[model samples]
Target: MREYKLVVLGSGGVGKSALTVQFVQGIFVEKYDPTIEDSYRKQVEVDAQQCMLEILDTAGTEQFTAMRDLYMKNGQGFALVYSITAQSTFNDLQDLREQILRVKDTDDVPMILVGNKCDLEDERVVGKEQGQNLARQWSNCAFLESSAKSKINVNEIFYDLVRQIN
Candidate 1:
């Protein structure tokens, strides 16, 4: 069956797990290390039928570019997630974008720069312009942010994810 491939490229503790539950009421489909590698599910319809979906998570890990290469090559769309509370988490994603383009070897792939906060009560290590500027440098890569705690409209960008992939 034809399927849509999605990638969640982000740091480990950046609330991707929390985000997953928000998207499609889904869970992981893989038994790989949950910290670095795992995948989630989605089911969608086109006209009168549907297709399968597998959203892979390549969370923060070492530069073992081997697995990273696999993720980059296999993914049809990507979500490079970052956190506002962790300054390094935001900066670390610079590698995710570059490595994916290097591995995917093209600029046409669908990707978005997504940001989340540690908590509404947490500090802001990453400012709006910082994320915006990084996104600006890309080929109109999408960018958006929301809080998982308050559930402030997070899935729209992922709708963008699947939409762009299609």
Candidate 2:
């Protein structure tokens, strides 16, 4: 089986932890305290290939700012998460992407632009098209909107990242 390290990043409350947990455990957390850093391991099959996945759920707080570079360096792939209800969170991804590129020392990294909380369609501030367009700005990256609570596209995000990593 192949192995990969994947990191999920976004501003706090963007549902990074929720999405990661949901994807790995098939359960949605109604309330999650902000995480400093948490790791999960799971065996999954994607496209008929067995793989071991190490998922790192990162804290979105500035308190962990020093560790961001280390996280970027260790990850083989990344999920740049943002909440559709928060435009600022969407904008924050640009800086995070730059940091990952700088730490990885490459422009072409395995990554995805994820707009989480899609179930809250009534409160969305960032449109689906906008997310797709922003992702298009980054070559070799995929984009998708997901809802952790509704279990929509959560597994697909990680599966897509693993495929990209391979």
Candidate 3:
């Protein structure tokens, strides 16, 4: 089976863990719990090919910033997350992406910009067009809006990343 290491990065409370857990376990977490770091392995099929996915769900807090370089270096692809309700979280992704590119030592790395919490339309601060525009600005990065609670695009994000890595 093919294998890939995928890292999920975003600011705290942006639903990075929620999205990862929902995708891996098929469940939703209503409460917020800070994650330092966690690893999940699962066998999944993409395009009729079975593959093993090593997913690293990372801490979003500032205290964990020191470890980000290691994560980026080890990861083959990424899910760059942000909460649509928080513009600051969205803004932070630019620096995070830059760090990933630097650590990977390539400008052509595979990644996706994810706007999480899409179900909470009333709380959204970042517009869908803005997310798309930012992804376009980055060049070659895919963009999608997902809701962990509703399980929207959760699988698509991972699937897309794996395809990119392949």
Stretches of candidate 3 exceeding 4 Å from the true structure: 32-34
Clashing pairs in 2: none
TM-score of candidate 3 against the unseen true structure: 0.95
- Ten-residue region with minimum lDDT total, candidate 3: 60-69
Model 2: per-residue lDDT, tens digit, 1-166?
Answer: 6788999988888998999999989988887574458888889998889999999999884445667789999899999999999999999999889988998889878998899999999999999989988987876548989999999999999999988987
* TM-score attained by model 1: 0.80
Candidate 1: misplaced stretches above 4 Å?
26-36, 44-51, 63-66, 118-122
lDDT of 1 at 140: 60
lDDT of each: 0.72, 0.89, 0.89
lDDT preference between candidates 1 and 3, better one = 3
Q: Write the per-residue lDDT of candidate 3 for residues 40-109, one digit (tens) a residue.
A: 8888999888889989999884646677788989899999999999999999999988988888888889
| True lDDT of residue 34, candidate 1 | 46
Higher-scoring candidate on TM-score, 1 or 3: 3
* Superposed Cα deviation of residue 111, candidate 3 (Å): 0.3
